[PDB]
C-alpha cells in the first residue's frame, strides 16, 4: 500500500519484462486466451497497419472457441485500424 | 436490507439478474441511493432560511454519479449518507435548494446523489441565494512574457515558492471552486472564487504551481473565470458527434405510470402527499396525485442499462435527469436514447421521455455509459508498409505533434528523419557529422554500447557503429529492399504509426478506461507508451531503435552478408491432425540435444495453427525433415504414445533425427532452407530472437531501459493489473508471486534481490 | 386426457367459445371460479403478479379490458385461468349429455394431464355431484393458483439483452424462456448438445430436459439466458430450409430439426423451483384430495402408476413435485392399456396434446376426439 513502494516494484517489474523480452518465446496464444476467456472481451481492436493480430484472433476464434462462444452467448467483434476504421470512432450515416 | 432492494426493483420496473440473486451478480439499484440516503437528502431543505411552502414542493432534478473505481451497491453493505447544501437560488418558476449526497462505504465515497429541489412561488429572500458551482478545468497556455506578465498581474493570482519553474513555454490547469451570493436575480450580490493552477512536467508530475483567490461584493460576473474564458481553453469535455447514432432504435420505448403511487411511496420513503391523497394534492394546485419524479427517472433510467450498457450495470457511471413534465399515474411515456458523445471512453447516452399523448417532455438528460469489453492489441514487425498512418498525419492535428516531436528528436541526434524513411522508403541512407550540432550526432553514434563476452567469461563491451570515429564524417545505412525493411527504421516507425493512431482515438474520447492491452514483439513497446505513459515519446523512439540494433549485431554475418541463422513459421494441422502443440514441441527439444544445434518454439500465436521456430540453419532443416517425414509417414502421437511406451517413440524418433541430420550436412554449404510440407521459412530474419540466444544483450538493453524510463513516470494504477506482457502470458500484477513466476522463467538478479528483501515492502 | 402449457396463447380465446356458446351450462362455474380468483389475487403474496388485475369476467364482458397476451400466458394467470377452460369443457361433456359428473367419470378407464394438467385430471376423478364437482373445482383451479404464483416468485422474469434478444427472434426461435422445444431431434444427440453447452456454464445456469413427449419430440429448462447458448450451437449444426440434400449420402446430411421457445413463464420440473414447492405447500394444506377420492385411476406424471395406489395421501404433495420437479415422461404416463379413444379436453384447439399424443400412438389403432373445438384443421382427429 506504500505508492512510492510499489512504484519501483513496477518499475523494476517492468524494466525486468522488457529486458528479458528479447531472450523469451511470445505466447501470444496464451494471451490472447487471457483476452477472450479470462476477461471475455467483446470488441477486440487492433493497432497497426494491417489486421495481422486481427485474423490470428479469428483464427483463435475458430479453432477454440468455437462451442464456447455458443454456449456462453458472448458476442465478439474484431476490428483493426486500418479496415475497421469507421466502426472505431463510432462513425455511422442515418 | 436484502429484501428492501428486491422491493425497489420489482416496483419501478427494474429485472437484471444482477439484482436478483443468480448468475454472476447481485448487485443494488443506483437507484437505491435516493432511498438510502433519502434522509441527508431532504433533510437540508427544512432550515430557517429557506422558508418555503414544502407543500407545494416539487422534485425538480436528480442525478448519481458513482465516483471512479467503485463497485456498485451490493446487499451486505453499510453506508453513510452525507450531505450538504450546494445552492439554494431563487429562480422565477419558484425557489431551488441544490443538495449534494455523498454515500460513503468503508470510509471511502462510492458516489454522489445530486438533488435539486422546487418551492414554486415568488421569492425575494435573497439575503439566503447562493451557490457553490465547481467551474469548468481550464487550459491556459503561456506563450509570451507578456501573456506570462499579465496572469502575473493578477491579483487573484498567487505564485507558489516551490520553485522557479519558469512558466513561459508551458500551460496551466485552473481547477476552480467558487462560492456566489445572489441580491438581484441579475446582480451577484458577493462572489469568491479560490482554486489551484497546476502545472505538468516532461515527467507528468503534478505541481501546484500557484493558487486563485478572487473576492467581490456587487458583481455582474465572474472577473476570473472571464480572464481564463478567453485566454485558455476548457478541459476533460464531451466530445460529441456529428450523428447522434439512435440507440433506441426508431420504435419508441414506452412506459406506464402505474396507478397508485403507493407502492413506491413504501419502497421509496417519500409518502409525500401530494402523490398518494386525493385531498392533499389538491391543495397544492396540483393535476393531481403526480406520479413519483424519481419513479419516472429510475424506470426510464432501467432502459439506458438494458439497452446501453447492456444489463452489466457497472458500466452506467452517471445519469441525470431533469424532470419538466408532471407525470399523472397511468400516463403512457414515451422514451428516446441516443448515443451523441464520448468522454474518456463513456458513451455519452441522450435520454428523452414524452407524454405519448401531449409529446410534452417528462424527462430530459444525459447518462454515461462505459463501452462494452475492449482490449487493445498492437500489431508487431511484418505488417510494416510504405507511407503508413501517413494519411492520418495530415488529417489528425494531434498525431500530426507525434510524429514530429519523434522526428524532431532522430534528426538532431541521430541525424535522420523516420517520416522520410516512412513516406518514400530509400534503400539507403546516409547520415552527415557536420559542423557544430553535426559533431554531437556522431557524438551518439559512437556511444552505442553493443555487448558480449568471450567463450572465458570476459564481458568485451564493443562499438554498434564500428566505423563511426572521431574521423567519420558520415555513415550509412543500407538494405537491398528499403530502410524501412531493417529494424532499426522499421521498429520506431511501427511504434510512432501506433502511437498517433491511438493517441487520435484518445482525442475523440474512445479509450476506454479499464480495458486490457498486448503488443507482439514489437508491439509491446508502443501498446505500453500508448495506454500507460511509461515513457515519453523520443525515449520510445530511442528505447525502441536501439532494440532493434542489438538484434541485428546479436547474429554472426560473414562477407557475403550471409547470416549464421533464421526463422521459420511451422502449421502443426498440415502435418497429422493428431498433432498438437505440445507434439511439436517434443520434435523440436528432442531435435535440440541430439543434433546439439540451436533450435526452439519461439513463437506461440495459434493454438494448432501457427508457431515459429528460431535457430541454426540445419537446425531448421532437420526440424522441416522430420515433419516433411511424418507427414508422408501418416502418424498418430495418441495411439503411439501407448502402443509404445515413452522411451520407445523417443528414441525412435532420434533415429529419424540423425538420419534427417546428417542428409543437411550433404548440403553443408551455409544451408539453405525451403518451403516444407507445414514448414514455411519467413523471408528477411538473420537472428533467433525471442530465443534463448538474445540473453546475451539482455544485460546492455536493461541498462538502456533504465536510462529511458524513469519510476516517477509510472502510474502503476495503470499497468495495475490490465497489461500483458509477452513473458507472463497474463495481466501485469505487483504480487510477490507475480516477480516469482517472473524470476521463475526469467531468472532476474534484479528480482532475486528484490524477493529476498519481500518484506522489506511491507 | 388433459393438456395445458404448450404453445398456446389464445387459450383465452377458447375462453371465449365456451362462455358464448355454452352459456347456460357454464355461467355458474365461471362466475364463482372468477370470483374466486379475484379473492386470491387480492391475498398481499399474490398483488405483485396482477397488476394488470385478475378479473375474468371483466374481461369477458368488454373486450377491450382484456389484458396482453404477454399478461395472460404467465404462470400466475395462465395456470388457472387455463384450468378453468379445461374445467368448462368436461362439465359442457357432461352436461350435454344430460348427465352427472359421476356418469361420465365411470365411463372412462384412466386420466392423465400434461404437467398443469395433471390436476384438474386428479380433481375431475373426485367429483360424482354436480356440488362434488364444483368441490373439486374451486380445488384444483386455486391449486393452480398457488402453484403458478409460488414457481414465478421462485425464478421470476429476468430482462435480456436486447440484441440476443432480437437474434433468437430473427433466428426462427421465439422470444427467449425457460422452456425451449425440440422437435424432429432424438434424445441421444439432443443430450448430447445439452451436455457440451452445460460444459461451459456455470452449475447454477445449466440446463435440464423438462419433459419428453415422444422420441423425438423434447422440451429443455434452465435460464432463457443459457438456454439460448444451446440454440447458437443448434443453429450451427442444422441446415437451411433451402438446402437440397436429394443428392447427399444419407448417413452425410445436416439434420432438419425444429428449436424453438415456448410460451411458458417459469422452469418446471428443474431444480430452479426448488424454494417454490415449499411455500404451495402452507397454501393448500387446508384442502387434502386423498388417493381414496380419485374413482377413475390418475397416472403420475414422472412414473406411469396411479394415484390410487397411495394410502390416502393428500395429493397436492405429489401433484405440485411432478410439476415443479418431476420431469414429465409424457409418453410412458399415456401408455393407456388397451385404449381406444382418448379424448383431449385440455386447451388449445388442434394444439391440444390430442395430436402430440396421436402421433405416438397412431399406428396401434388409438383414436384421438378434441372435446376443445367442435372442428378444426386436422384429418387425424376427430
Known amino acids: 500500500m506504500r505508492p512510492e513502494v510499489e512504484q519501483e516494484l513496477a518499475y523494476t517489474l517492468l524494466v525486468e519484462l522488457l529486458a528479458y523480452q528479447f531472450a523469451m518465446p511470445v505466447r501470444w496464444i496464451e494471451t490472447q486466451d487471457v483476452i477472450l476467456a479470462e476477461k471475455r472481451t467483446e470488441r477486440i481492436v487492433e493497432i497497426g497497419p494491417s489486421d495481422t493480430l486481427g485474423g490470428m484472433a479469428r483464427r483463435t476464434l475458430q479453432s477454440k472457441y468455437e462451442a464456447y462462444d455458443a454456449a456462453t452467448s458472448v458476442q465478439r467483434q474484431i476490428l483493426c485500424y486500418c479496415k475497421d476504421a469507421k466502426e472505431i470512432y463510432y462513425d455511422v450515416e442515418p | ?762 | ?382
Not at chain 2, 473576492?215 to 469535455?237: C, F, K, M, T, W
Not at chain 3, 388409438?366 to 373445438?373: D, E, K
Request: a negative charge; hydrophobic letters at 40%.
Open chain 2, 1 to 762: 436490507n436484502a429484501q428492501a432492494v428486491a422491493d425497489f426493483v420489482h416496483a419501478v420496473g427494474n429485472t437484471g439478474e444482477a439484482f436478483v440473486d443468480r448468475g454472476k451478480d447481485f448487485f443494488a439499484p443506483m437507484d437505491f441511493a435516493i432511498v438510502v440516503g433519502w434522509k441527508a437528502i431532504t433533510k437540508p431543505i427544512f432550515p430557517r432560511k429557506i422558508d418555503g411552502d414544502l407543500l407545494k414542493l416539487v422534485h425538480l432534478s436528480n442525478g448519481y454519479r458513482m465516483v471512479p473505481g467503485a463497485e456498485p451497491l451490493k446487499v451486505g453493505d453499510v453506508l453513510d449518507t452525507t450531505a450538504q447544501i450546494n445552492a439554494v437560488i431563487n429562480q422565477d418558476s419558484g425557489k431551488m435548494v441544490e443538495v449534494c449526497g455523498t454515500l460513503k462505504r468503508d470510509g471511502k465515497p462510492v458516489m454522489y446523489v445530486t438533488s435539486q429541489f422546487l418551492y414554486r412561488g415568488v421569492y425575494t429572500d435573497y439575503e439566503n441565494t447562493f451557490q457553490r458551482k465547481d467551474e469548468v478545468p481550464m487550459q491556459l497556455h503561456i506563450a509570451t512574457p507578456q501573456d506570462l506578465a499579465v496572469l502575473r498581474s493578477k491579483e487573484w493570482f498567487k505564485l507558489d515558492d516551490q520553485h522557479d519553474i519558469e512558466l513561459l513555454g508551458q500551460t496551466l490547469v485552473f481547477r476552480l471552486q467558487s462560492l456566489v451570493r445572489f441580491k438581484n436575480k441579475n446582480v451577484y450580490s458577493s462572489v469568491q472564487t479560490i482554486g489551484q493552477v497546476l502545472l505538468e512536467l516532461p515527467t507528468k508530475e503534478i505541481i501546484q504551481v500557484a493558487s486563485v483567490d478572487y473576492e467581490a461584493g456587487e458583481s455582474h460576473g465572474n472577473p476570473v473565470i472571464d480572464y481564463l474564458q478567453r485566454h485558455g481553453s476548457s478541459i476533460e469535455q464531451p466530445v460529441n458527434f456529428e450523428n447522434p447514432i439512435p440507440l433506441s432504435g426508431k420504435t419508441p420505448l414506452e412506459l406506464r405510470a402505474p396507478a397508485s403511487n403507493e407502492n413506491y411511496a413504501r419502497v421509496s420513503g417519500d409518502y409525500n402527499p401530494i402523490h398518494v391523497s386525493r385531498v392533499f394534492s389538491s391543495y397544492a394546485n396540483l393535476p393531481g396525485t403526480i406520479t413519483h419524479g424519481m419513479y419516472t427517472s429510475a424506470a426510464v433510467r432501467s432502459l439506458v442499462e438494458t439497452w446501453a450498457a447492456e444489463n452489466n450495470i457497472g458500466r452506467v457511471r452517471s445519469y441525470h435527469v431533469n424532470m419538466v413534465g408532471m407525470v399523472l399515474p397511468n400516463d403512457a411515456i414515451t422514451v428516446k436514447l441516443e448515443h451523441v458523445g464520448m468522454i474518456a471512453g463513456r458513451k455519452i447516452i441522450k435520454v428523452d421521455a414524452r407524454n405519448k399523448d401531449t409529446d410534452e417532455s417528462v424527462l430530459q438528460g444525459e447518462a454515461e455509459v462505459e463501452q462494452p469489453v475492449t482490449a487493445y492489441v498492437f500489431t508487431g514487425q511484418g505488417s510494416q508498409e510504405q507511407g503508413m498512418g501517413m494519411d492520418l498525419y495530415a488529417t489528425s492535428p494531434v498525431a500530426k505533434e507525434v510524429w514530429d516531436r519523434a522526428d524532431k528528436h532522430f534528426r538532431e541526434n541521430y541525424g535522420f528523419s523516420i517520416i522520410d524513411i516512412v513516406k518514400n522508403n530509400p534503400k539507403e541512407l546516409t547520415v552527415h557529422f557536420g559542423g557544430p550540432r553535426g559533431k554531437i550526432i556522431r557524438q551518439n553514434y559512437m556511444s552505442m554500447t553493443f555487448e558480449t563476452v568471450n567463450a572465458d567469461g570476459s564481458i568485451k563491451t564493443e562499438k554498434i557503429f564500428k566505423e563511426v570515429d572521431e574521423n567519420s564524417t558520415s555513415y550509412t545505412y543500407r538494405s537491398p529492399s528499403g530502410l524501412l525493411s531493417a529494424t532499426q527504421f522499421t521498429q520506431p516507425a511501427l511504434t510512432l504509426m501506433e502511437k498517433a493512431s491511438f493517441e487520435d482515438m484518445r482525442s475523440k474520447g474512445l479509450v476506454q478506461r479499464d480495458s486490457t492491452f498486448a503488443g507482439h514483439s514489437l508491439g509491446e513497446y508502443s501498446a505500453l507508451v500508448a495506454l500507460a505513459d511509461v515513457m515519453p515519446i523520443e525515449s520510445l523512439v530511442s528505447v525502441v531503435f536501439y532494440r532493434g540494433l542489438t538484434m541485428q549485431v546479436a547474429v554472426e554475418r560473414d562477407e557475403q552478408g550471409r547470416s549464421n541463422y533464421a526463422m521459420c513459421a511451422v502449421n502443426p494441422s498440415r502435418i497429422s491432425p493428431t498433432f498438437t502443440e505440445q507434439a511439436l514441441q517434443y520434435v523440436v527439444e528432442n531435435i535440440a540435444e541430439v543434433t546439439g544445434w540451436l533450435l526452439e518454439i519461439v513463437n506461440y500465436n495459434v493454438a494448432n495453427m501457427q508457431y515459429v521456430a528460431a535457430g541454426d540453419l540445419r537446425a531448421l532443416d532437420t526440424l522441416a525433415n522430420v515433419l516433411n517425414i511424418l507427414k508422408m509417414q501418416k502418424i498418430d502421437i495418441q495411439a503411439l504414445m501407448q502402443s509404445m511406451s515413452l522411451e520407445d517413440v523417443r528414441a525412435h524418433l532420434v533415429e529419424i533425427i540423425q538420419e534427417c541430420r546428417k542428409q543437411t550436412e550433404a548440403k553443408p554449404q551455409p544451408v539453405q532452407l525451403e518451403r516444407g510440407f507445414a514448414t514455411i521459412p519467413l523471408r528477411g530474419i538473420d537472428v533467433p530472437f525471442h530465443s534463448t540466444f538474445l540473453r546475451s544483450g539482455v544485460k546492455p538493453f536493461r541498462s538502456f531501459l533504465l536510462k529511458k524510463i524513469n519510476k516517477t513516470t509510472i502510474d502503476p494504477s495503470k499497468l495495475i493489473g490490465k497489461y500483458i506482457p509477452n513473458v507472463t502470458a497474463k495481466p501485469f500484477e505487483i504480487s510477490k508471486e507475480y516477480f516469482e513466476e517472473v524470476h521463475r522463467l526469467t531468472g532476474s538478479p534484479k528480482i532475486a534481490n528484490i524477493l529476498a528483501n519481500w518484506d522489506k515492502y511491507e
Open chain 3, 1 to 382: 386426457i388433459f393438456g395445458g402449457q404448450g404453445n398456446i396463447e389464445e387459450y383465452f380465446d377458447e375462453l371465449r367459445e365456451i362462455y358464448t356458446t355454452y352459456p347456460s351450462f357454464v355461467e355458474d362455474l365461471i362466475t364463482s371460479i372468477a370470483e374466486l380468483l379475484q379473492s386470491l389475487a387480492r391475498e398481499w403474496d399474490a398483488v405483485k403478479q396482477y397488476p394488470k388485475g385478475l378479473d375474468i369476467l371483466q374481461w369477458l364482458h368488454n373486450p377491450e379490458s382484456q389484458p396482453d397476451t404477454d399478461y395472460l400466458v404467465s404462470a400466475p394467470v395462465s395456470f388457472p385461468l387455463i384450468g378453468l377452460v379445461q374445467l368448462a369443457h368436461y362439465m359442457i361433456t357432461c352436461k350435454t349429455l344430460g348427465r352427472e359428473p359421476g356418469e361420465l367419470l365411470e365411463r372412462f378407464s384412466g386420466t392423465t394431464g400434461h404437467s398443469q394438467g395433471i390436476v384438474v385430471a386428479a380433481a375431475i376423478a373426485t367429483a360424482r355431484t354436480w356440488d362434488e364437482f364444483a368441490t373439486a373445482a374451486k380445488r384444483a383451479v386455486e391449486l393452480l393458483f398457488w402453484i403458478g404464483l409460488r414457481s414465478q416468485q421462485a425464478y421470476p422474469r429476468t430482462s435480456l439483452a436486447p440484441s440476443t434478444l432480437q437474434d433468437s427472434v430473427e433466428n426462427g426461435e421465439g422470444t427467449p424462456t425457460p422452456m425451449l422445444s425440440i422437435r424432429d431431434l432424438t434424445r441421444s444427440a439432443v443430450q448430447e448438445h445439452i451436455d457440451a453447452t452445460n460444459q461451459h456454464l456455470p452449475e447454477d445456469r445449466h440446463i435440464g430436459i423438462s419433459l419428453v413427449n415422444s422420441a423425438r419430440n423434447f422440451v429443455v429448462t434452465g435460464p432463457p439466458i443459457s438456454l439460448y447458448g444451446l440454440n447458437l450451437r443448434l443453429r450451427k449444426v442444422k441446415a437451411p430450409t433451402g438446402l437440397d440434400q436429394n443428392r447427399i449420402p444419407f448417413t452425410q446430411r445436416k439434420a432438419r430439426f425444429v428449436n424453438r421457445f415456448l410460451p411458458i413463464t417459469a422452469p418446471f420440473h428443474s431444480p430452479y423451483l426448488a424454494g417454490a414447492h415449499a411455500h404451495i405447500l402452507g397454501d393448500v394444506d387446508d384442502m387434502k384430495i386423498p388417493a381414496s377420492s380419485l374413482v377413475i385411476p390418475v397416472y403420475d406424471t414422472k412414473t406411469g402408476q396411479d394415484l390410487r395406489e397411495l394410502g390416502d395421501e393428500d395429493i397436492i404433495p405429489e401433484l405440485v413435485r411432478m410439476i415443479t420437479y418431476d420431469p414429465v415422461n409424457w409418453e410412458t404416463a399415456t401408455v393407456f392399456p388397451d385404449a381406444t379413444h382418448i379424448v383431449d379436453f385440455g386447451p388449445g384447439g388442434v394444439s391440444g396434446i390430442g395430436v402430440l399424443t396421436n402421433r405416438n400412438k397412431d399406428g396401434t389403432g388409438v383414436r384421438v376426439i378434441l372435446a376443445g373445438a367442435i372442428d378444426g384443421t386436422n384429418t387425424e382427429v376427430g
